[PDB]
Amino acid sequence: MGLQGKAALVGVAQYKPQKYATAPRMFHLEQVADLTLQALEDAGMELSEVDGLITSAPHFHEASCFVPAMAGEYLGVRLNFAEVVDLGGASSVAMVWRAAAAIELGLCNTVVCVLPSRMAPISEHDSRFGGHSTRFGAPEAEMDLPYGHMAQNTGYAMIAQRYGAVHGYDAAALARICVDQRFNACHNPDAMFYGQPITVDDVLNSRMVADPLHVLEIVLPAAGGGAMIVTRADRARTTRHRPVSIVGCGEHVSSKSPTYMADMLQTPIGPASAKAFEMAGMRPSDMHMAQIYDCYTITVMLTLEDAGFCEKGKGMDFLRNNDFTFKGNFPMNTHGGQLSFGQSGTAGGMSQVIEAVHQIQGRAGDRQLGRNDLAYVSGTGGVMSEQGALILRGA
Amino acid sequence: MGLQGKAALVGVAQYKPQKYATAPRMFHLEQVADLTLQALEDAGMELSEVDGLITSAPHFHEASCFVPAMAGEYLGVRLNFAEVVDLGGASSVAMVWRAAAAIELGLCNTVVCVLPSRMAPISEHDSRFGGHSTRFGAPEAEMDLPYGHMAQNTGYAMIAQRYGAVHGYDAAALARICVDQRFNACHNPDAMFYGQPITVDDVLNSRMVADPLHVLEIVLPAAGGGAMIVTRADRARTTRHRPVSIVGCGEHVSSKSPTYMADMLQTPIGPASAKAFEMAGMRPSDMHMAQIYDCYTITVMLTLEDAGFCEKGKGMDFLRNNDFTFKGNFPMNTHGGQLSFGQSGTAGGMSQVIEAVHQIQGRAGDRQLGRNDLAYVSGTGGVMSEQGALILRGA
Amino acid sequence: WNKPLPHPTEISAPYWEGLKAHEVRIQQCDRGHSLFFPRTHCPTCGSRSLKWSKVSGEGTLYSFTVARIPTMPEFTDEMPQALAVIELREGVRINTTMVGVAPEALKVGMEVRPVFDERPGEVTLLRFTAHAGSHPSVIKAD
Amino acid sequence: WNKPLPHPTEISAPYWEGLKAHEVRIQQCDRGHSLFFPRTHCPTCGSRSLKWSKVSGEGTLYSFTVARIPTMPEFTDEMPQALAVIELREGVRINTTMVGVAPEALKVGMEVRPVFDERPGEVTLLRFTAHAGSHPSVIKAD
Ligand SMILES: [Zn+2]
Ligand SMILES: [Zn+2]
């Protein structure tokens, strides 16, 4: 049951994360074409082979609706699967397994998952709340906003405060995530913070946003984008690189605000990762790498626990006693993660997937892992809201 | 390797189509809850069983993004599949096969497919192009709008005019679609035009909207909404009515504007229907009913041709030589279709799926088909843009 | 008051009206499930039989944080923002802020009691304080 | 013009500038595929090496319709709107309207000529007319 591993990632492409002030301006339709063709060239396939497309539903600059039709028309493809997702940072992992499902279902042969994240040029004839809805009837508009609750920082901070009171807290242990991932980024010329190492005290000395989260434990919004090609296992054999099979997946959404979680310390990556490991017939100890969605340090540590890599409540202990660099025993976000490689909006989650593909394909350069067969990848949207997991295995 | 038919429609719910003046206003989250619970009650299931949710992505009144999360939180369900679609009128059939794909893949036991279509209450603190985008970079904003091309009426008129030039045109033949479907609605107390029979003359003498399309050949806009429960085959055994298995599906999007179609007369419902018939191991001649998306009479005739019910260029004569009432030899849109039952905005296409479920479950009252086991269902968005096809089979 | 205010719907209206009467009123389905935020259905069992009833309003601090950068510039006069999540004895959770408690004494699990904030004017907001503290139950408009 | 006007992008600017020069410019990849609307890639083969080719603007009327109800009030002075789709000799299709011919006279497949509509002032639009007709190739602003 579940995915049988007959779909594989064969081509990737992504813009270098760059600050909004200086990043190139590109229409979202233009980005869709540019990123798809780049990823197709990386795979060694041409345009007419694409019979499936997945992208993000909200905030597509040129279309408030009919996004698949307009994007596919601009691209020039004939789609048997016209898909959009609306899961925030979890979107990237959500598109990957949907592409595999459609290919294993026989609907498609080759699916492109693409997320534009650069802003479009401005015309003379043409966000405070951080994504919270102000619409009449939206519960959070009347229950969150009047009290200052909004966006993501303070929500994740209240999760961190709950964890500290229940299981203990070590500010320096969480800072280990920033230091090791920055080390990884310091060996990635494409990373935003390439050549910019940090220390533990650097993180603690950075400004407090909301107790106990510091600015350096939080991603810096940036522009970018990315796309990935998924195709059938047989066609994958004649592509350019090692196929990266999609052998397990999981998805879970049980709340929007963390306030209505059954337990803010039981995050949805638990159920999602248990389904993905089960589907792949594998266990956390089988993985050679973990590309973990890292908008906040606390999200990484909670993913470490709930995905089964360490015991619930010993996350700080796991962070103190392990080396998370590409030279370490538990390589993690070996591209730098969104924290240090840069967060390209909703495409930031795709950096995790692409790095897993790079590592498995033997294309990671100075950061290449010795064991590069098996990868766990997570995606997280909102504040512990939307979650997905992937198990990937090289051919 | 398509669907194995292990998911089934078990419960439906549908607001009666109403003009926007009589139409009550409810929040889209409110409609999600109300319609979901009505459909669950129709199937005899509980809210606790729902672990999958599909709805429409754009113009969700209370949320421009994170629609699955806000709706799932408001409804109170824990989702292993959080899905949105952006395919216009083809959204309903698109949701059904996605729900079956997730159930057969093992992620969900029960998926709710819901489309709010009533407007929300207005507030002090809170569209002349008919859905066309005006955004900078949208191709139709500069290639369509300044020349008056927009909305749907003229686009379908230009497809009809092209057909008449290539294959000949018979306006009285199209009128039979209106007459026979109105006859069906005349035996449907829930239909908008219940008890109001019309003749071919009434259709031909109605006002011309855009040559060669008459007023009576075009749906009128109305408010409504619908929900649909899909569940595993085994759980469907103990639900209240006959399970309606989803044995075949297909999807195709190859153009937004018909101007860029390879050929406006070769429409994307063909490829989608061929895949659905192939996957169900079935032929058009095996169907006991055809519930065809009918926002325009020309859509129905082209769907009959391209789906395989008659030869290309012969659709005019098929309309002349067959009886499309529920008493006829080719029962079609037996609830009256959107033309005579009412078009509930985006939820209009759901009326085609619901009527098939009603027929297959033996719940269609006076219009009940004696032979009620196999159904072909189509959904169409835009101007022959987004297309989906379903083959449904009673248990 | 330049901050965001609630714009009650006809679904949530009885809750914001109860606060105006210095009462915390939440819905309870006919099977015994309390719910919040307000809905037209029970998010636990789906029942449509909901009854509004006053609750004592006391509970525990489920979690909290202290904003050192204001979440919005118009919350500067509330700084530092003691953002809090309260779980009433009924088991529902309410977003709010703490008043009359030093940020450094905030502690996950403290007993809390409601404070009705009339400063916005026509709208009454719901804040919380330490149960054993002396902070009054109402904050009148300036 | 009070009606909607094109807002050219850096991608489509050469086409709209071409109309100002009384030219119909259509992109072609170096593999020979023509494309419209304008893009930065070939929608056929994915090539990024595109050139702007000068075409005669001649073609055939692919389809048409006569608007009896205005697509919006702003086009009432153009009634009845002869909405049209032209297929150029090179194979691309263009949305437009027909001028210099009766709307009810049109026929699918008839040969057409381009007509550069300068009436909006700074923006020139592309209309079409019968190839054998007497309508000029330009409409000078009023
Ligand atoms: Zn209940
Ligand atoms: Zn080309």
Numbering used by the authors:
A (entry chain C), B (entry chain A): 1 to 126, 136 to 404
C (entry chain D), D (entry chain B): 3 to 144
Manuscript excerpt for this entry:
CtSal cleaves the C5 side chain of bile acid thioester steroids, whereas a previously characterized actinobacterial homolog from Thermonospora curvata (TcLtp2) targets the C3 side chain. The proteobacterial steroid aldolase, CtSal, catalyzes the retroaldol cleavage of the C22–C23 bond of bile acid side chains. Each aldolase forms a complex with the hydratase responsible for the preceding reaction in the pathway via their DUF35 domain.
Crystals of the CtShyDUF35–CtSal complex diffracted to 1.95 Å resolution. The CtShyDUF35–CtSal complex adopts an αββα heterotetrameric (diprotomeric) architecture, featuring a central CtSal dimer flanked by two CtShyDUF35 domains, with a total buried interface area of 9540 Å2 (CtSal–CtSal and CtShyDUF35–CtSal interfaces; calculated using PISA). CtSal adopts a canonical thiolase fold, consisting of two pseudo-symmetric αβ domains: the N-terminal domain contains a five-stranded mixed β-sheet (topology: 1, −5, 4, 2, 3), while the C-terminal domain harbors a four-stranded mixed β-sheet (topology: 6, −9, 8, 7) (positive integers indicate successive β-strands oriented in one direction, while negative integers indicate β-strands oriented anti-parallel to these). The CtShyDUF35 domain comprises an N-terminal zinc finger and a C-terminal oligonucleotide/oligosaccharide-binding (OB) fold. The fourth coordination ligand, His36, completes the coordination sphere by forming interactions with the zinc ion via its more sterically accessible Nδ1 atom. In CtShyDUF35, the repositioned zinc ion compacts the β1–β2 loop against the α2 helix in CtSal, drawing α2 closer to the steroid-binding pocket. Consequently, the β2–α2 loop protrudes into the active site in CtSal, occupying the region where the steroid nucleus binds. The CtShyDUF35–CtSal tetramer has two distinct pockets separated by the β2–α2 loops of both protomers, unlike TcChsH2DUF35–TcLtp2, where shorter β2–α2 loops create a single long cleft across the TcLtp2 dimer. The 30-residue β4–α4 loop of CtSal forms part of the wall on either side of the substrate binding site, while its central region (residues 127–135) spans the top of the active site but is disordered.
